[PDB]
């Protein structure tokens, strides 16, 4: 109250910070109403917001200094590096909202009961902390005066945790979120008659569907990301106010049951096992439906035409089912509000009706990937002015013809995916006018010609995927201006020339795959200036000279974060004929079926069956890392391997096989702790196998055959694991698994 007490409480909080300089304008002889982070009314402090400031202090400092302020109405400390746990404290009765999200609060969730000191508390957000529920679930939260409680993203593992929260009553509760825990058991919110928002998603619920009682107030129901399979239809039948219903990522089955459609705006049944065709009774929702997600089920049939009246539908996700027929334009154009259209991974056939060019001017995302669409790409597409299309996903179809340069009109285009098709012609230089294009993916086509240098104008280019084409020429110098590139893969073309030394300017460059081309010259030492390079595949080319030791200078300082989250497939080498080269083909694979990897048989000499790994890219570190994959096999590299080769603790494959490398294996190779595969076969390596290699503990595969090696095999680590074949054609070589070292 009194200004003297206000200032001293606040400054005592500042004086406890490890870095007092985080609150620079907080001074012991100014009015706190002038402080950054402070809100005042009539010269009295009412709210404090130090969110996203690394205060690095325990909750004891908060409760004793800030939460004791008389008249403080709200305290926001989201992502402030608060740790410790909530304990008893004297709480101003004016405090109504407390945001302690995204901190390091620990202890059992029963600690939050001590927040009952706050007689006026109505909003509590302790999400993204480490509260848990050890031992028995008993007692109660005893915060029944709350209107909004968010316990999401904690470490709460237990059954009937929800009952524990609401045990003491929930008449006042309007918004409950406990998502992202490991909670199970029953959800009984029938006594919470003013509950409008319920999010129990991403938990461990596998038994009863939540019981909603009269469901008088519920507008938002999210039970997705569990293992539910019960009769949710009966559970929500009385939910006349339900605006959002998310039951996706569960174990539900059967046809689409009855649903409350009066107020329904968002409906997701995605990632379940629902069957049948889209029922007609869903037309009742078209007065209000703004988003529909039926993706990832066993639906079939055409798109019912009642969807024509769904004029408010902004997103229509039907992907990964078995819908067939031609592109139902008769219905799509009536969807005046449609902004996202996802029919991917279906069996929609036919050519692209001309009327499709109209949707370009309203859609933001047109996803038709993985279907039976034939014919060419509409040249008249995007010819409608002020087009708004941002994502065009047509990959894995049967499109023929050329890439229409008119796609340059789609000025708002950020991602372009024409891969896995039969497109001929060249890459039009007009694509360089896409000032916002980030993803350009055109791999597995029949594109001839050179790469357009007009891409130097695309300063936002992030990925550049052009594998399996007939491209000739060199790497255009203009791409140096594409400094945001994090993925460039040009393999299986007929490219020539060298790797430009400006490759080291691309600090975001993480993956660089150039295999099965005719690149020449030495390895640029500037590849060591790449702060993000983690995947380097140069196999089957004409590189010569020696390996520069400088390319491994960024080891221990590599960052790999922008590259994470990208769908890929890794096709392990068949290990059969000498035709298949390299460890494996890392291939971009967004919106493509692995079943259609048979198309690679006409372009890749490898056996694909039982050798295709997939998923989303996930580097083994966030910072202070190194290179992960290094394959320069099938070239003409000479000289000796530099000792710096062993400075990559995250390298799990190293293939230098089929070259002209001389000298001995550096003992530093034994520092490659993470090495899974080590191929050095078909070279001129001489000397003994360094004993330090017996320290490699994760080698699932080695091959030192066809060299000039001699002496005993380390035979102290994993070398006995391997069959003789991996050591044959080394005359002087001996020791198990080879014949014993004799005179
Ligand atoms: C109906 O219910 C369903 C199911 O419950 C629900 O679907 C979930 O929706 C949420 C929110 O949309 C999803 O969670 C988010 O997923 C994001 C994607 O994570 C991937 O990509 C990350 C990189 O993102 C960047 O790059 C990618 C690729 O270049 C690009 O697409 C992105 O736009 C972006 O630029 C990547 O880091 C991540 O990998 C890490 O995380 C995953 C776990 O998610 C882990 O498995 C990996 O090992 C790795 O650690 C992954 O590949 C992601 O952006 C996002 O995270 C941000 O937001 C959260 C808060 O939402 C913050 O906590 C976080 O700090 C980030 O800011 C978040 O995780 C979720 O995956 C969906 N679940 C399913 C099953 O689909 C619907 O939304 C509901 N619908 C409604 C309510 O209408
Ligand atoms: C660098 O790129 C060029 C292309 O630019 C690659 O050369 C291509 O290689 C293709 C695959 O070898 C080849 O197509 C094949 O052609 C023959 C007839 O000529 C067909 O029989 C093949 O399809 C049929 O047979 C294969 C047989 O099995 C495959 O896998 C096993 C694995 O050991 C091998 O024995 C065999 O070599 C096959 O690869 C079946 O898988 C098929 O389903 C089908 O029944 C192929 O279509 C192209 O003609 C050829 N291109 C050129 C320009 O000559 C080149 O190999 C590549 N090099 C690399 C990556 O190192
Ligand atoms: C309790 O605190 C947590 C932690 O702050 C809080 O969760 C956070 O909520 C915000 C807001 O919803 C999330 O950020 C959103 O993320 C999604 C996906 O990227 C977007 O839809 C949102 O965009 C909105 O904001 C943009 C910027 O203004 C707008 O351009 C856009 O139109 C949208 O309005 C938004 O960025 C954030 O990710 C979470 N954080 C975590 C860690 O989950 C939670 O809401 C709080 N609980 C309560 C009950 O208030
Ligand atoms: C790496 O190769 C380049 C390109 O030339 C190839 O390799 C040569 C050794 C020879 O076999 C050529 O027919 C190949 O096309 C080399 O540049 C060549 O340098 C050599 C040696 O002085 C010379 O005879 C050629 O004329 C050069 N070619 C050109 C186009 O200027 C380069 O020197 C090779 N690097 C090493 C370390 O040998
Ligand atoms: C590719 C995308 C990555 C990004 C980060 C670039 C990342 O997302 C991946 O997870 C990557 C690091 C995976 C996919 C394929 C896996 C292969 C499988 O094939 C084998 O069998 C190999 C031989 C042997 O079995 C060995 O033990 C396992 C081997 C080497 C693994 C290694 C790890 C993977 C490479
Ligand atoms: C998710 O729920 C399942 C099922 O309730 C849990 O598995 C049970 O674990 C207990 C404790 O060990 C066992 O007594 C049961 O036999 C298990 N049941 C089954 C069907 O396996 C599982 O542990 C939960 N997971 C988490 C992360 O909480
Ligand atoms: C998915 O749909 C396809 C396409 O309809 C089904 O395969 C057959 O398709 C032909 C038309 O080309 C129909 O005459 C047949 O009746 C379809 N078969 C059956 C059994 O319905 C395919 O079976 C469907 N299922 C899956 C899992 O893809
Ligand atoms: C690719 O590998 C698969 C196995 O992953 C091979 O499958 C063989 O199939 C033939 C008949 O076509 C059988 O005689 C073999 O016994 C199978 N081998 C297995 C299952 O290991 C397939 O032949 C390989 N393809 C090529 C071209 O070599
Ligand atoms: C909170 O973080 C500080 C700063 O690292 C640390 O010294 C302290 O031990 C932490 N407190 C608890 C209770 O873990
Ligand atoms: C459509 O392509 C799928 C594979 O993506 C195939 O199973 C199906 O038979 C094809 N349909 C027609 C009519 O060609
Ligand atoms: C390309 O980068 C060079 C300098 O490396 C610069 O002179 C040139 O103007 C850049 N191009 C564009 C279009 O900005
Ligand atoms: Na081109």
Is residue 194 located within the same domain as residue 160?
Answer: yes
Residue 610 lies in a domain: no
For residues 469 and 449, give the distance between their C-alpha atoms in angstroms, rounded to a whole number. 10
Pocket of ligand 10 (CB under 6 A): 347, 349, 372
SS3 state at 584: strand
Pocket of ligand 3 (CB under 6 A): 78, 101-102, 125, 127-128, 148, 150, 175, 177
Helical ranges in 622-676 per DSSP H? none
CA of 324 to the centre of ligand 7 (A): 9
Same domain as 155, residue 114: no
Q: And the tokens for 524?
A: 């640029």
Helix/strand/coil for 328: coil
579 Cβ below 6 A of ligand 2: yes
Identify the domain boundary among 124, 142, 177.
124
> Which atom belonging to ligand 2 lies closest to the Cα atom of 581?
61
- The Cα angle at residue 362 between residues 360 and 364, in degrees rounded to 5: 75
Contact by Cβ (8 Å): 532, 560: yes
Helix (H, G, I), strand (E, B) or coil at 526: helix
Q: Please indicate, yes or no, whether residues 80 and 166 belong to a single structural domain of this protein.
A: no
> Tokens at residue 666, please?
């550096």
Atom of ligand 3 nearest to the CA of 148: 49
C-alpha dihedral (630, 634, 639, 640), degrees to nearest 10: 40
253 lines ligand 2 (CB under 6 A): no
Write the CATH number for 136: 3.80.10.10
What residues form the annotated binding site for brassinolide? Answer: 568, 613, 618, 676
CB crowding 453-471: b at 16 or more within 10 Å, else e: ebbbbbeebbbbbbbbbeb
Peptide bond into 397 cis (omega under 30): no
How far apart CA 487 and CA 587 sit, in angstroms, is: 11
CA-wise closest residue to 656 among 630, 689, 692, 687: 630
Residue where a domain stops, chosen among 223, 251, 279:
251
Indicate which ligand has the atom closest to the C-alpha of 402.
Answer: 12
Contacts 24+ apart (CB under 8 A), 729-737: 729/705, 730/704, 730/705, 730/706, 733/689, 733/709, 737/713
Say how many Å lie between the CA of residue 319 and the centre of ligand 1: 18
Distances (CA, A) of 431 to 477, 495, 563, 693: 17, 20, 23, 50
What burial class does residue 554 get, using C-beta atoms within 10 Å of its C-beta: 0-12 exposed, 13-18 middle, 19+ buried?
A: buried
In whole angstroms, how far apart are CA 530 and each of 409, 483, 520, 533? 34, 11, 20, 5
List beta partners, residue 74: 47, 97
Enumerate the known binding-site residues: 568, 613, 618, 676
110 and 219, same domain (yes or no):
no
C-alpha of 256 from chain center:
30
Structure tokens at 381: 């597409």
Eight-class DSSP state of 10: H
Buried b (16+ CB within 10 A) or exposed e, 633-668: bbbebebbbbebbbbbbbbbbbbbbbbebbeebbeb
User: How far is it, in rounded angstroms, from Cα 82 to Cα 105?
Assistant: 7
Q: Which of 58, 80, 86 to mutate to test the pocket of ligand 9 (most atoms within 8 A of CB)?
A: 58
User: Can you say whether residue 690 is alpha, beta or left, with left for phi > 0 and alpha for psi between -120 and 50 degrees?
Assistant: beta
Domain membership of residue 74 (yes or no) is yes
Could you count the other beta carbons within 10 Å of the beta carbon of residue 296? 21
Q: Could you give the CA distance from residue 330 to residue 337 in angstroms, rounded to a whole number?
A: 15
- On whether both 192 and 87 belong to a single domain, the answer is no
Maximum CA pair distance of the chain? 98
Q: How many CB atoms within 10 Å of residue 184?
A: 20
Contact 480 CB / ligand 11 (< 6 Å): yes
- How far is Cα 419 from Cα 444, in angstroms, rounded to an integer? 6
In a domain, 177, yes or no: yes
Residue 586 Cα to ligand 2 middle (Å) = 18
Query: Helices then strands (H, E): number in the chain?
Result: 6, 49
Do 170 and 85 fall within a single domain? no
The protein residue with its alpha carbon nearest to ligand 2, atom 26, reads 601
Q: Is 510 left (phi over 0), alpha (psi -120 to 50) or beta?
A: alpha
Ligand nearest to the CA of 61: 9
Residues forming beta bridges with residue 464, ordered by sequence position: 440, 488
List, chain by chain if needed, residues with CB within 6 Å of any ligand 9 atom.
56, 58, 83-84
Buried b (16+ CB within 10 A) or exposed e, 320-348: bbebeeebbeebbbebeebbbbbbbbbeb
Phi and psi angles of residue 683, each rounded to the nearest 5 degrees, phi first: -140, -170
- State the ligand closest to the CA atom of 159: 6
Looking at the fold, whether 240 and 146 belong to one and the same domain comes out as yes
Query: Do 177 and 208 belong together in one domain?
Result: yes
Q: Is 577 in the pocket of ligand 2 (CB under 6 A)?
A: yes
Boundary residue ending a domain (64, 97, 124)? 124
The residue written with tokens 């968002």 in the block is 266
| Structural domain harbouring 13 | 1-124
Tell me, in angstroms, the distance from the centre of ligand 1 to residue 340's CA: 18
**Measuring CA to CA, how many Å separate 324 from each of 146, 451, 480?**
50, 37, 45
Method: X-ray
Q: Please give the distance, rounded to the nearest whole angstrom, from the Cα atom of residue 635 to the centre of ligand 4.
A: 14
Closest atom of ligand 3 relative to the 197 alpha carbon:
49
d(CA 45, CA 4): 12
Query: Can you spell out the DSSP letters for 336-379?
Result: TT--EEE--SSEEEE---TTHHHHTTT-SEEE--SSEEEE---T
Asked if residue 71 and residue 9 are part of one domain, the reply reads yes
The reply to whether 709 falls in a domain is no
546 CA closest ligand 4 atom index: 37
Distance, CA of 123 to CA of 169 (rounded, Å) = 16
Closest ligand to residue 326's CA:
10
DSSP run (H or E) holding 123? strand 123-125
Residue 85 CB–ligand 2 contact under 6 Å: no
Are 80 and 26 contained in the same domain?
yes
- Report the nearest atom of ligand 3 relative to the CA of 78: 5
Ligand 5, atom 8, residue with closest C-alpha: 617
Q: Are residues 63 and 118 in the same domain?
A: yes
- CA 120 from centroid of its chain's CA atoms: 41
Domain count, the chain: 2
590 CA to middle of ligand 8, Å? 28
User: Quick one: tokens of 182?
Assistant: 């490991």
Which candidate, 82, 78, 40, 43, places its Cα nearest to that of 65?
A: 82
Residue whose Cα lies nearest atom 3 of ligand 7: it is 322
In total, the chain counts a number of residues equal to 743
Pair (116, 138) in one structural domain: no
The answer as to whether 213 is a domain residue is yes
């Amino acid at each position: 109250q009194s200004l003297y007490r206000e200032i001293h409480q606040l400054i005592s909080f500042k004086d406890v910070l490890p870095d007092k300089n985080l609150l620079p304008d907080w001074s012991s002889n100014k009015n706190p109403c002038t402080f950054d982070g402070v809100t005042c009314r009539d010269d009295k402090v009412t709210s404090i917001d130090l969110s996203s400031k690394p205060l690095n202090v325990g909750f004891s400092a908060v409760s004793s200094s800030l939460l004791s302020l008389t008249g403080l109405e709200s305290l926001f400390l989201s992502n402030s590096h608060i740790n410790g746990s909530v304990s008893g404290f004297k709480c101003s009765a004016s405090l109504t909202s407390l945001d302690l999200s995204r901190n390091s609060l620990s202890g059992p969730v029963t600690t939050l009961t001590s927040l009952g000191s706050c007689s006026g508390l109505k909003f509590l957000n302790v999400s993204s902390n480490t509260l848990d529920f050890p031992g028995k679930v008993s007692g109660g939260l005893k915060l029944n005066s709350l209107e909004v409680l968010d316990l999401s993203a904690n470490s709460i593992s237990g059954a009937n945790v929800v009952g524990w929260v609401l045990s003491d009553g929930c008449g006042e509760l309007k918004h409950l979120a406990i998502s992202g825990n490991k909670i199970s058991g029953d959800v009984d919110v029938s006594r919470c008659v003013n509950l409008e928002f319920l999010d129990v998603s991403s938990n461990n619920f596998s038994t009863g569907i939540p019981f909603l009682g009269d469901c008088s107030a519920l507008q938002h129901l999210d039970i997705s990301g569990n293992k539910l399979s019960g009769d949710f239809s009966r559970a929500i039948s009385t939910c006349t106010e339900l605006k959002l219903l998310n039951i996706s990522s569960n174990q539900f089955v059967g046809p689409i049951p009855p649903l409350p459609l009066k107020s329904l705006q968002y409906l997701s049944l995605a990632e379940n096992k629902f069957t049948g065709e889209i029922p007609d009774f869903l037309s009742g929702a078209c007065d209000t439906l703004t988003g529909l997600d039926l993706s990832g089920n066993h639906f079939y049939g055409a798109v019912p035409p009642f969807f024509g009246s769904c004029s408010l539908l902004e997103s229509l996700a039907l992907s990964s089912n078995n819908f067939s027929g031609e592109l139902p334009m008769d219905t799509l154009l009536k969807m005046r509000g449609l902004k996202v259209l996802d029919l991917s991974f279906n069996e929609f056939s036919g050519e692209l009706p001309e009327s499709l060019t109209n949707l370009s001017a309203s859609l933001l995302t047109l996803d038709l990937s993985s279907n039976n669409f034939s014919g060419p790409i509409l040249p008249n597409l995007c010819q409608n002015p002020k087009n708004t299309l941002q994502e065009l996903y047509l990959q894995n179809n049967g499109f023929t013809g050329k890439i229409p340069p008119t796609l340059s009109n789609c000025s708002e285009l950020v991602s372009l995916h024409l891969s896995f098709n039969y497109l001929s012609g060249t890459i039009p230089s007009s694509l360089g006018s896409l000032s916002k294009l980030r993803d350009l993916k055109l791999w597995l086509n029949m594109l001839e010609g050179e790469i357009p240098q007009e891409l130097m104008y695309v300063k936002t280019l992030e990925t550049l995927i052009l594998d399996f084409n007939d491209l000739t020429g060199e790497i255009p110098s203009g791409l140096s201006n594409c400094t945001n590139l994090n993925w460039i893969s040009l393999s299986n073309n007929r490219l020539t020339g060298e790797i430009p030394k400006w490759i080291g300017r691309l600090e975001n460059l993480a993956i660089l795959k150039l295999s099965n081309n005719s690149f020449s010259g030495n390895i640029p030492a500037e590849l060591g200036d790449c702060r993000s390079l983690i995947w380097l595949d140069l196999n089957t080319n004409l590189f010569n000279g020696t390996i520069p030791a400088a390319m491994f200078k960024q080891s221990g300082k590599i960052a790999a974060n922008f590259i994470a989250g990208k769908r890929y497939v890794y096709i392990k080498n068949d290990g059969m004929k000498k035709e298949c080269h390299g460890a494996g083909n890392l291939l971009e694979f967004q919106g493509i079926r692995s079943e259609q990897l048979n198309r690679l048989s006409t372009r890749n000499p490898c056996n694909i069956t039982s050798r295709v790994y997939g998923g989303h890219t996930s580097p083994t570190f966030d910072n202070n890392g190194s290179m992960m994959f290094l394959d320069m096999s099938y070239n003409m590299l000479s000289g000796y391997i530099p000792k710096e080769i062993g400075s990559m603790p995250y390298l799990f494959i190293l293939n230098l096989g089929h070259n002209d490398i001389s000298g001995s294996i550096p003992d530093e190779v034994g520092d490659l702790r993470g090495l899974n595969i080590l191929d050095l076969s078909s070279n001129k390596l001489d000397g003994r196998i360094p004993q330090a290699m017996s320290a490699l503990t994760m080698l699932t595969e080695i091959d030192l055959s066809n060299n000039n090696l001699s002496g005993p095999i380390p035979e102290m680590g994993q070398f006995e694991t391997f069959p003789p074949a991996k050591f044959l054609n080394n005359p002087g070589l001996c020791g198990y698994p080879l014949p014993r070292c004799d005179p």
